[PDB]
């Protein structure tokens, strides 16, 4: 079962790329030693081959959101929006092993390695939630195969396809946002400001003297609060395509996926919680080539069976199933 979700991000999407990369004030990535350098946290870029500038094949980087991040976002959305309220309604309680399995598929609950009988595999892989995301001490094969969030760009034509050519962006989609942290003590201006500080003026004087001495020592050869740097993000408004496939899905699993897609807009993508990065709105959801996204979320006469099945599953779901899956 193929799920095609068209995602447009209202706010920039920031997936931090590993590594210590530098940038200058003018915007030159990795400036030479001559000019000043400031730390930069670039976006997650994947090397892809594309026909750039009428070339036969060019390995150009493409800013994407990692597929594992999308998988974890879907899992967290399910847990925090349908699974956890359903278990709370029954006053269910989970041990550490079951909870770790449910939230990250971590086998710490029973790292011995437990055999699974064929009947047990049949029963558990049919679970509405744990079947999609395999793991735990048993560590099955999940039925969910979610792709990365490839932007609809010129370089992603051979990964996305030509079905959504109308929304492609020709130029670059990355922008550098500069951050700064200021020492609050240096911004005091009157004894009224320093009234709340227990040391009053003396504490601020000692703080400023220590800062000056540390700065002088560092210039001659403990880190203060003051810091200036930038992080690279993907510009807002770019459309993204998310491809989700479920292998041999039951009605309950598809219903759960649809519920998560309904509640997915409330969550964020990748990082940037402080700056409200990653906010997005679902534009279209496609089920096996059939559009299902109504303005009131995923609905229609062709998905009532999935919603009914998942509602029935939520009605009878208990923590004992999670414990059995986690071998706790």
């Amino acid at each position: 079962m193929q799920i095609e979700v068209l995602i447009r991000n209202i706010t920039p999407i920031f997936s931090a790329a590993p590594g210590s990369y530098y940038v200058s004030l003018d915007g030159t990535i990795n400036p030479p030693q001559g000019a000043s350098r400031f730390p930069l946290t670039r976006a997650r870029t994947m090397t892809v081959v594309a026909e750039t500038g009428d070339g036969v094949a060019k390995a150009v980087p493409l800013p994407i959101v990692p597929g594992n991040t999308m998988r974890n976002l879907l899992r967290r959305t399910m847990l925090k929006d349908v699974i956890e309220p359903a278990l709370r309604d029954k006053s269910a309680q989970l041990s550490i092993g079951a909870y770790a399995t449910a939230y990250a598929g971590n086998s710490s609950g029973n790292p011995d390695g437990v055999p699974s009988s064929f009947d047990e595999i049949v029963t558990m892989r049919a679970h509405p939630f744990l079947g999609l995301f395999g793991g735990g001490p048993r560590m099955l094969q999940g039925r969910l195969m979610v792709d990365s969030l490839y932007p609809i760009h010129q370089f992603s034509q051979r990964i996305i396809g030509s079905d959504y050519i109308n929304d492609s962006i020709k130029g670059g989609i990355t922008e550098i946002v500069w951050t700064r942290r200021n020492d609050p003590i240096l911004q005091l201006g009157s004894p009224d400001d320093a009234a709340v500080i227990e040391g009053g003026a003396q504490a601020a004087n000692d703080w400023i003297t220590s800062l000056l001495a540390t700065t002088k020592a560092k210039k001659g050869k403990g880190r203060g609060l003051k810091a200036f740097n930038a992080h690279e993000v993907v510009i807002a408004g770019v459309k993204w395509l998310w491809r989700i496939n479920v292998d041999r899905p039951s009605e309950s699993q598809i219903g759960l996926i649809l519920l998560a897609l309904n509640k997915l807009a409330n969550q964020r993508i990748a990082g940037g919680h402080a700056k409200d990065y990653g906010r997005f709105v679902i534009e279209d959801v496609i089920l096996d080539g059939e559009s299902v996204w109504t303005p009131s979320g995923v609905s229609g006469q062709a998905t009532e069976q999935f919603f009914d099945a998942i509602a029935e599953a939520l009605d009878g779901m208990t923590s004992s199933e999670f414990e059995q899956f986690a071998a706790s």
């Binding site: 086998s107 011995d112 390695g113 055999p115």
Partner: protein, 240 residues
């Protein structure tokens, strides 16, 4: 040797611990080293605990650990074998870069196990496949199992030397990381991309991850001189 657990009774010669159960069912493989646990052997049910984060590398779901793995799971064994090379003669330390260069350029002929940890101390005793032939060395680095070919390492070193032969400022042709964590690990540098022939670039792009990891410790501006690693089995036995 044949199995990772074989290092105990062959180079450490440690007798089995007391109070171990005896198998009396149809033989099943060890949960760590995949060694068969036949009738009449000594084992113990798995009690790894909640801090065991290597369930993905377990050989089988037998939940049984042979006495050799029970020895190899001791803290003194895990700490001592963090940067070890276990051959027939003894256990050698490959922590230094010169030792790694010697291992990946002049490997010992006998079967050996190569150890290396990516953190303070990790379970590596029971996850390393044996190296039957020195021309195909299997190295376990943290959670990564690497394949290193000494001929590929030698060819890459020759390529780097020929590319840096003329220029006075030595510069690596390929980006490498000791931790194998950088996003540019294994990618050609600017010097390699715009100063190497097509054959050299194709060879450098078509190397195994283990070869990149090894070159990250061998290939440098001043190539370390290979030297024989010291015998370490005495220290591990004394600390046990």
């Amino acid at each position: 040797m044949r199995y990772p657990s074989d290092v105990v009774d062959q180079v450490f010669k440690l007798p089995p611990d007391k109070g171990l159960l005896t198998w009396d069912n149809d033989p099943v493989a060890c949960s760590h080293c995949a060694r068969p646990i036949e009738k009449g052997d000594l084992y113990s049910p798995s009690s790894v605990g909640a801090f065991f984060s290597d369930t993905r590398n377990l050989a089988s779901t037998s939940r049984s650990i042979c006495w050799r793995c029970l020895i190899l799971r001791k803290k003194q064994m895990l700490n001592g074998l963090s940067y070890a090379l276990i051959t027939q003669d003894g256990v050698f330390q490959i922590s230094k870069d010169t030792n790694k260069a010697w291992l990946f350029t002049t490997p010992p002929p006998a079967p050996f196990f190569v150890m290396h940890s990516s953190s303070t101390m990790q379970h590596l005793c029971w996850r390393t496949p044996v190296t039957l032939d020195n021309r195909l060395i299997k190295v376990r680095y943290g959670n990564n199992l690497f394949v290193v070919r000494p001929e590929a390492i030698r060819e890459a070193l020759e390529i780097a030397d020929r590319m840096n032969e003329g220029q006075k400022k030595w510069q690596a042709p390929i980006f490498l990381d000791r931790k194998a964590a950088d996003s540019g690990h294994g990618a050609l540098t600017k010097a390699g991309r715009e100063h190497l022939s097509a054959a050299d670039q194709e060879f450098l792009l078509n190397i195994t991850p283990g070869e990149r990891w090894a070159l990250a410790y061998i290939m440098h501006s001043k190539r370390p001189q290979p030297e024989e690693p010291e015998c370490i089995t005495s220290k591990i036995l004394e600390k046990l």
